[PDB]
């Protein structure tokens, strides 16, 4: 009957209470900081550093639309200014503007969803507000980019252990540019440069007739209305983490940690101050700028500062994750995929830390996509998922007492074909190896809650280590999968093996 099982969620560690005092925010070889730390003050808009725009146009940094190297020779940035500084009264005006500096895509890019949103979804007053106020304000913050993002932004490339800390205001200027599709070299289907990076320009949000698109657009315009009306004052950190020292899982003598499991609630609302998992695509954010609308995309829509990770985050390799600290929630929603609806504007009540970052930490970890259900029990694939989750959970240089619980759920299930009971145990083992408790949301599935709880209590009461459990997974593969759906399910197999 009960709605939750295991350790009370009130007993789990959360930020900021559990953290240590942050070191002085400072730029270094592994930390890009794009604002004046000496002037960072609560409730004040951060000042960009440096004061005057500095450009880098190379294979290691974002290619900025305002670069003097962005040519067409004509200046693409001048063309963008001329195109966007026109009155919009009808959606065709905005399509024509975006296409003036995207001539090569004038036959490839469809704007049906934008036209339908403006003309067929919005009432007359809402459309009027969109084109008299919201869009012109978005144009202005976009065109302010050279005065806002004065410091080159390095790409968080494969195998880099590197962090970028920037202001929410800087992110808003960059995302307004993404909306107007101004980022060069990010568009071609057959590009080699940036082929390993996600889409950033928003043009696919404008294509097609899904009922999903107006909801995505409502969610994003809620954000844009908010951050053009009053500049957000905080910072956001993006950290790419690449590990090479992974556990020898079969030999790991670490005990399991604590579990709270519930079929009610969500990661983002009920896991406040916890390490919140994004069920990510290896191209971070997935189809947020196109058709996708499941856990990752929804989180990227209600916390749009996440979307800018796509500007500079290379596709994740198996040993990598992306950790984002400080994104703000601007929207509330209901549903998902075909039922997703924008509900209302959200006033984020999270505390900020000593770097003026909202106390919200999200980790993008991408599960594997399994063509065949039994493929996921292959030991190499189980080890891969363990190592991915471990990389997402591990904080080198931090004591376990200062680590929040992990707030997660059915990672890699649904579209990717993962088995929820296996993935729950994999996350429990990885969390144990990283010395972090687990808060698990089963998203309405009460039987799964009971099953994960019962397995966890079974294993903990018998004092099985991480390695004891991993060896049982290996036995399951050999006994029920390798020479095989299997005859016996995983948790029944485990109970029988141990008993
Ligand atoms: C724990 N958890 C979720 O599982 C979740 N799924 C979604 S939409 C995609 C359908 N899912 C159904 C459950 O299996 C994973 C895929 N939003 C979610 N949120 C906000 C959440 O907190």
From Swiss-Prot:
Outcome after substituting residue 416 to A: Abolished poly(ADP-ribose) glycohydrolase activity
One GO location term (cellular component): cytosol
Keywords: Acetylation, Cytoplasm, DNA damage, Hydrolase, Mitochondrion, Nucleus, Phosphoprotein
Superkingdom to which the source organism belongs: Eukaryota
Effect noted on mutating residue 297 to N: Reduces hydrolase activity
The enzyme's E.C. designation: 3.2.1.143
Location of the region described as Catalytic in the Swiss-Prot/TrEMBL record: 151-336
The keyword Phosphoprotein belongs to this UniProt entry's keyword annotation: yes
Molecular-function annotations in GO: poly(ADP-ribose) glycohydrolase activity
Catalytic residues of the enzyme: 278, 296-297
One GO term of the biological process aspect: ATP generation from poly-ADP-D-ribose
Tissue specificity of this protein: Ubiquitously expressed.
Reaction equations catalysed: [(1''->2')-ADP-alpha-D-ribose](n) + H2O = [(1''->2')-ADP-alpha-D-ribose](n-1) + ADP-D-ribose
Positions bound to substrate: 267-268, 281, 295, 336, 410-415
Mitochondrion listed as a keyword: yes
Family: Belongs to the poly(ADP-ribose) glycohydrolase family.
Biological function: Poly(ADP-ribose) glycohydrolase that degrades poly(ADP-ribose) by hydrolyzing the ribose-ribose bonds present in poly(ADP-ribose). PARG acts both as an endo- and exoglycosidase, releasing poly(ADP-ribose) of different length as well as ADP-ribose monomers. It is however unable to cleave the ester bond between the terminal ADP-ribose and ADP-ribosylated residues, leaving proteins that are mono-ADP-ribosylated. Poly(ADP-ribose) is synthesized after DNA damage is only present transiently and is rapidly degraded by PARG.
Domain notes: The PIP-box mediates interaction with PCNA and localization to replication foci.
Summary of subunit composition and partner proteins: Interacts with PCNA. Interacts with NUDT5.
Protein name as catalogued: Poly(ADP-ribose) glycohydrolase
Species of origin: Homo sapiens
Full protein segment contained here: 450 to 961 of 976
């Amino acid at each position: 009957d009960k709605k939750w099982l295991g350790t009370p969620i009130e007993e789990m560690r959360r930020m900021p209470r559990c953290g240590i005092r942050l070191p002085l925010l400072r730029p270094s070889a592994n930390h890009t900081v794009t604002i004046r730390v000496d002037l960072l003050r609560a409730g004040e808009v951060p000042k960009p550093f440096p004061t005057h725009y500095k450009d880098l146009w190379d294979n290691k940094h974002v290619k900025m639309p305002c670069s003097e190297q962005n040519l067409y020779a004509g200046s693409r940035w001048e063309l963008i200014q001329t195109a966007l500084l026109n009155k919009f009264t009808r959606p065709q005006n905005l399509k024509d503007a975006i296409l003036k500096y995207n001539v090569a895509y004038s036959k490839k890019w469809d704007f049906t969803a934008l036209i339908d949103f403006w003309d067929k979804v919005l009432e007359e007053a809402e459309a009027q507000h969109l084109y008299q106020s919201i869009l012109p304000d978005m144009v202005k913050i976009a065109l302010c980019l050279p005065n806002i993002c004065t410091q080159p932004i390095p790409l968080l490339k494969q195998k880099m252990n590197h962090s970028i800390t920037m202001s929410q205001e800087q992110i808003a200027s960059l995302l307004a540019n993404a909306f107007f599709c101004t980022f060069p070299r990010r568009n071609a289907k057959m590009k080699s440069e940036y082929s390993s990076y996600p889409d950033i320009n928003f043009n696919r949000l404008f294509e097609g007739r899904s009922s999903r698109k107006p909801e995505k657009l409502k969610t994003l315009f809620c954000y844009f209305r908010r951050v053009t009306e009053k500049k957000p004052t905080g910072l956001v950190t993006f950290t790419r983490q690449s590990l090479e020292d992974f556990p020898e899982w079969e030999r790991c003598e670490k005990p399991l940690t604590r579990l709270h499991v519930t079929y009610e609630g969500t990661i983002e609302e009920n896991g406040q101050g916890m390490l919140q998992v994004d069920f990510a695509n290896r191209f971070v954010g997935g189809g947020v700028t196109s058709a996708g609308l499941v856990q990752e995309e929804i989180r990227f829509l209600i916390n749009p500062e996440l979307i800018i990770s796509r500007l500079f985050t290379e596709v994740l390799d198996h040993n990598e994750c992306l950790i984002i600290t400080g994104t703000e929630q601007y929207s509330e929603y209901t549903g998902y995929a075909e039922t997703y609806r924008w509900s209302r504007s959200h006033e984020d009540g999270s505390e900020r830390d000593d770097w003026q970052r909202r106390c919200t930490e999200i980790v993008a970890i991408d599960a594997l996509h399994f063509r065949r259900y039994l493929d996921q029990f292959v030991p190499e694939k189980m080890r891969r998922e363990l190592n991915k989750a471990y990389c997402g959970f591990l904080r080198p240089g931090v004591s376990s007492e200062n680590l929040s619980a992990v707030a997660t759920g059915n990672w890699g299930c649904g579209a990717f074909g993962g088995d929820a009971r296996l993935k729950a145990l994999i996350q429990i083992l990885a969390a144990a190896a990283a010395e972090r408790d687990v808060v698990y949301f089963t998203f309405g599935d009460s039987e799964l809650m009971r099953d994960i709880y019962s397995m966890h209590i079974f294993l903990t009461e018998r004092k099985l280590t991480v390695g004891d459990v991993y060896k049982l997974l290996l036995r399951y593969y050999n006994e029920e999968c390798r020479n095989c759906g299997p005859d016996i399910k995983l948790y029944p197999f485990i109970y029988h093996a141990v008993e």
